[PDB]
Amino acid sequence: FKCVNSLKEDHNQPLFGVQFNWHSKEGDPLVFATVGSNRVTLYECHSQGEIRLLQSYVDADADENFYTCAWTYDSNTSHPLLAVAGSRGIIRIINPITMQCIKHYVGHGNAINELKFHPRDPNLLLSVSKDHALRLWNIQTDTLVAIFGGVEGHRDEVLSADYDLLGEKIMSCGMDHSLKLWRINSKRMMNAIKESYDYNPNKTNRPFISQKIHFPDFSTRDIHRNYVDCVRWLGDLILSKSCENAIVCWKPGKMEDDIDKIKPSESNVTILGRFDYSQCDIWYMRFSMDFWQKMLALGNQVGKLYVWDLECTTLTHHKCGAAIRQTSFSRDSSILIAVCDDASIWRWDR
């Protein structure tokens, strides 16, 4: 990788999120979104390292602090859509063509730390919050499908979550040092999703009733000893990190235990490997994988970018010295974008 370009957003506030739109065809514009301050900005990647500013969304609330964004598409037209959220605990769905807010969802008792769209169902949006819960939304019918949390749910702020490859299950993590598994392919969750598609408030005076999932399908506090701020699936395996200068690769149960045979009382975990690095011991630092899950990237607190081949390399620039909060690879993995605490954006080309 070579650093081909960089820019600084005029708001001068930290950028906490960056996502390339992976829902565009080959030959279509390479677009990425950044989120920082109360702003959402779209950029287009062109040849010879050129970055073109497309549009900017500025939230009506000046006190909003966007922490996360995630792309989807409208199933009927294939038109892209962008979901954003942060400190206000409000999810906003933005039309990226006009950069206008189409709709909003309220419900979480606090800030939203991460948003993820179901890998198969583009209408299924997952949010994780400081209120200790995860929420699954159906954005086609504007319904709250399920709330994951309660007694045996997270006991502190949820920082991250990820769906597995097929979207049959979710792994979540947070400030309680725990990683929790929630199956959404159960008869209960499959019926709840089916019911959310039939719901329409114009044909009934009764509200749609959300599933209250109080119990995870697996839980562990034996991987990390501090806030777990990033979790991703790698097939049936899990990649997770805390502020202990390591990304841990692990699985629930014993070495040969099938993840779909695991009982909720499973007390074993198996560590399969570790990706070690330096100076990334502050909270709220996200790692990312390319579409192919062949590369793993993580920025550190002094602007160094670590890249590992999943099938190490350190990317540095003398002008890049602020914490890299999040990175995103373009769908073809030819471009890696890093966003920083000083509102700076860095473009690395393969």
Ligand X SMILES: CS(=O)(=O)c1ccc(-c2cnc(NCc3cccc4c3CCO4)n3cnnc23)cc1
> Nearest approach, Cβ of 163 to ligand X (angstroms)?
17
Task: Pick the piece of the chain touching ligand X (CB under 6 A) from 44-52, 94-102, 199-207, 282-290.
Answer: 282-290
Tokens encoding 286: 């996200």
> Nearest approach, Cβ of 179 to ligand X (angstroms)?
14
Cα(314)–Cα(6) distance, rounded to whole angstroms?
17
284 is an interface residue for ligand X by CB under 6 A: yes
x/- track of binding to Mg ion for residues 266-285 (CB under 5 A):
--x-----------------
337 is an interface residue for ligand X by CB under 6 A: no
SS (H, E, C) the chain: CEEEEEEECCCCCCEEEEEECCCCCCCCCEEEEEEECCEEEEEEECCCCCEEEEEEEECCCCCCCEEEEEEEECCCCCCEEEEEEECCCCEEEEECCCCEEEEEECCCCCCEEEEEECCCCCCEEEEEECCCCEEEEECCCCEEEEEECCCCCCCCCEEEEEECCCCCEEEEEECCCCEEEEECCCHHHHHHHHHHHHCCCCCCCCCCCCEEECCCCEEECCCCCCCCCEEEEECCEEEEECCCCEEEEEEECCCCCCCCCCCCCCCCEEEEEEEECCCCCCCCCCEEECCCCCEEEEECCCCCEEEEECCCEEECCCCCCCCEEEEEECCCCCEEEEEECCCEEEEEEC
> Nearest approach, Cβ of 13 to ligand X (angstroms)?
8
Comparing CB distances to Mg ion, the nearer of 49 and 167 is 167
Cα(134)–Cα(128) distance, rounded to whole angstroms?
4
Q: Which does 260 bind (CB under 5 to 8 A by kind): ligand X, Mg ion, none?
A: Mg ion
Q: How many CB atoms lie within 10 A of CB 190?
A: 12
Comparing CB distances to ligand X, the nearer of 193 and 243 is 243
x/- track of binding to Mg ion for residues 208-247 (CB under 5 A):
----------------------------------------
Comparing CB distances to ligand X, the nearer of 224 and 325 is 325
Task: Pick the piece of the chain touching ligand X (CB under 6 A) from 115-123, 140-148, 198-206, 279-287.
Answer: 279-287
110 is an interface residue for ligand X by CB under 6 A: no
> Nearest approach, Cβ of 328 to ligand X (angstroms)?
12
> Nearest approach, Cβ of 106 to ligand X (angstroms)?
18
> Nearest approach, Cβ of 295 to ligand X (angstroms)?
18
Cα(30)–Cα(336) distance, rounded to whole angstroms?
12
Strand order in the sheet with 305-309: 287-289, 295-299, 305-309, 313-315
Considering only residues 136, 341, 345, 347, which one is a binding residue for ligand X as defined by CB under 6 A?
341
325 is an interface residue for ligand X by CB under 6 A: yes
Please report, as residue ranges, which positions from 226 to 255 form the binding site for ligand X (by CB under 6 A). 229-230
Considering only residues 14, 80, 153, 216, which one is a binding residue for ligand X as defined by CB under 6 A?
14
Q: Which does 14 bind (CB under 5 to 8 A by kind): ligand X, Mg ion, none?
A: ligand X
Q: What is the CA radius of gyration of the chain?
A: 19
Considering only residues 66, 67, 117, 348, which one is a binding residue for ligand X as defined by CB under 6 A?
67
Comparing CB distances to Mg ion, the nearer of 137 and 250 is 250
Please report, as residue ranges, which positions from 249 to 268 form the binding site for Mg ion (by CB under 5 A). 260, 268
> Nearest approach, Cβ of 268 to Mg ion (angstroms)?
5
Q: Which does 159 bind (CB under 5 to 8 A by kind): Mg ion, ligand X, none?
A: ligand X
Kindly list the residues in this chain that would bind ligand X in the complex (CB under 6 A): 14, 16, 67-68, 111, 113, 159-160, 229-230, 284-286, 325-326, 341
